[PDB]
């Protein structure tokens, strides 16, 4: 997964550049991690894939 379910952050598109400066397309995927998030304490878990930026923030709970 390369899309965050909270902030919608997706992959960027750019180039891998060789020493000969040949540039081929590649992606910069967000650091998407699976979380089992809860809405209220003790509640049912829901599987999301969110970026480590949202995990570092308080956007999700476990």
């Amino acid at each position: 997964a390369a899309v965050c379910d909270i902030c919608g952050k997706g992959p960027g598109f750019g180039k891998s550049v060789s020493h000969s400066h040949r540039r081929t397309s590649r992606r910069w995927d967000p650091n998407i991690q699976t979380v089992h998030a809860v809405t209220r304490p003790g509640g049912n878990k829901k599987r999301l894939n969110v970026c480590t930026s949202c995990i570092k923030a308080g956007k999700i709970t476990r």
């Binding site: 809860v38 304490p41 995990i55 308080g58 709970t61 476990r62």
Partner: peptide, 17 residues
């Protein structure tokens, strides 16, 4: 160190931010 807190302390009600 931020993993202990959010994966063990907050879920179990041991601590709040």
């Amino acid at each position: 160190k931020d993993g202990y807190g959010r994966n063990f302390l907050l879920p179990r009600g041991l601590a709040i931010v």
